[PDB]
Write a protein that binds this DNA or RNA. Structure first.
Ligand code: NA
Ligand code: NA
Length: 327
DNA sequence: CATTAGA
DNA sequence: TCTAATG
């Protein structure tokens, strides 16, 4: 957790490099398994050799470790930290819509900057257009103050359109959290579940609503069960307009909401820990259901849920207010 | 680990 | 269709 601090960090920088700049899924995949294990290691690594005895630690990394342990740095790490090319890809990538592949391509055309981007806005697709457009706001955190307002909006429509809707703003927001990255709306409706052959309109219907009123301002992607867009709060009595905010609405078959919802609300740790428990308690949890574990090895059969409670019960835990779904 | 775009 | 990107 700290005794292995730098080692793990160098390792991740490294891993990251292969992954992004180079197309080195393997090397990259190496660095991380390595960073995973040294992290677990209970002791202060004193040398490559020592490290080396570990699984995943080949000679390649050991070597790296000594140098860093030796001198407060690593050259390669230094060389890469310097390089404009690689530097360039690390940057472009921030653009929502821009991945590594695209990053490299742009770079090799000479697109390195933001401006560069604008000059060749033509070479960009919609998503990437909007990513570039809202570059600034997309980087900014959402205050809970704002969150509440937004939420309030979405909840109001959803209902106005159909009363039978059920929306849940998941995430950290849902976990109390003072700020949030974007907003997630868990959507479900009774007339939609596991089997009931869809109702795409069920999604569409509301998307449309949000837009009609101008909450939704852009679409990154709209498909039958997953919308990806941009939204924004009505800039009051002027002098202050709102930043454009990332947003994701998604249709869920009523018979899987609470799992979905439990799940999405995290925290990543709570899940696992919650997940790990259902296992002893003879279960199996995942993004959509909970199933009784059968001796033979495995076993199925989707236990029925009407609240985040039911699920708890099943595994006989204490209902944890999301506030405390912290870990 | 899945759903959407894209070309 | 593959492949890329976000979640
Ligand atoms: Na080894
Ligand atoms: Na990006």
């Amino acid at each position: 957790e700290t005794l292995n601090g730098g080692i793990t960090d160098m390792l991740t920088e490294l891993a990251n490099f292969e992954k992004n700049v180079s197309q080195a899924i393997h090397k990259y995949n190496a660095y991380r398994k390595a960073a995973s294990v040294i992290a677990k290691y209970p002791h202060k690594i004193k040398s490559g050799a020592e490290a080396k005895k570990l699984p995943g630690v080949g000679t390649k990394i050991a070597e790296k470790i000594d140098e860093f342990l030796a001198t407060g740095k690593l050259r390669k790490l230094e060389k890469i930290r310097q390089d404009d090319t690689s530097s360039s890809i690390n940057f472009l990538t921030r653009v929502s819509g821009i991945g590594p592949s695209a990053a490299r391509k742009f770079v090799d055309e000479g697109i390195k900057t933001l401006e560069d981007l604008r000059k060749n806005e033509d070479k960009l697709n919609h998503h990437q257009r909007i990513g570039l457009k809202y570059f600034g706001d997309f980087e900014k955190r959402i205050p809970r103050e704002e969150m509440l307002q937004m939420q309030d909006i979405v909840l109001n429509e959803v209902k106005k359109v159909d009363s039978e809707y059920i929306a849940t703003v998941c995430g950290s927001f849902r976990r109390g959290a003072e700020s949030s990255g974007d907003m997630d709306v868990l959507l479900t409706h009774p007339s939609f579940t596991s089997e009931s052959t869809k109702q795409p309109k069920l999604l569409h219907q509301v998307v449309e609503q949000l837009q009609k009123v101008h909450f939704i301002t852009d679409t990154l992607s709209k498909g039958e069960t997953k919308f990806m867009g941009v939204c924004q709060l009505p800039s009051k009595n002027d002098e202050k307009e709102y930043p454009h905010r990332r947003i994701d609405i998604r249709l869920i078959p009523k018979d899987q909401y609470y799992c979905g919802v439990l799940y999405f609300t995290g925290s990543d740790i709570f899940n696992k820990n919650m997940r790990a428990h259902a296992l002893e308690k003879g279960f199996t949890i995942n993004e959509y259901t909970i199933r009784p574990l059968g001796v033979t090895g495995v076993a199925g059969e989707p236990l029925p849920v009407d609240s985040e409670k039911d699920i708890f019960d099943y595994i006989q835990w204490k209902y944890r207010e999301p506030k405390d779904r912290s870990e």
